[PDB]
């Protein structure tokens with residue numbers, strides 16, 4: 001089988017809900033997918049979803065479920081300079097991290113205290129967001145999903161309009177998504193980044209500071 005189906009099955013194996021995506025539109029198959037952050041899809045849907053994936057459909061992982069939040073950093077290099085290699089390697093040593101198809105990085109973690117909604121952006125630099133926190137009613141594409149950049153017609157894509165396909169891949173190794181003190185982490189990120197001029201967004205600071 002492909003890597004897309006292997007990993008999709010891995011998430012289902014671990015109790016996570018997944019949602020099909022990407023053919024024509026590049027959005028979930030269901031219009032009411034947001035509900036999968038709060039409930040299971042039902043067997044007679046789960047299998048339908050797999051078949052779609054086993055046949056070319058990418059898939060996504062909704063946040064919120066099981067305390068899951070995904071920190072979606074626009075640039076893996078920026079985060080490297082932001083918190084230093086050791087910190088990064090530590091973070092992505094204890095929990096699942098993946099490479100995005102545009103040079104970014106997704107850090108998956110579980111937490112007892114997470115936002116009720118996604119926070120976009122979580123941190124900002126020189127007036128722009130450099131990382132989104134995906135939680136309830138939001139998602140991230142899953143490992144194995146691939147994108148043909150031929151259809152990316154913006155500069156947000158480093159491979160703009162090239163006939164080239166890349167996929168969401170493992171940052172290092174496959175590991176279970178582990179628990180963290182999200183707030184402790186957002187604070188560690190805060191300090192570590194204050195020197196670079198990277199600050200919590202107002203929405204992020206209000207959820208953190210409470």
Ligand SMILES: [Zn+2]
Pocket residue numbers: 101102147148149152156157158159160
């Ligand atoms: Zn692209």
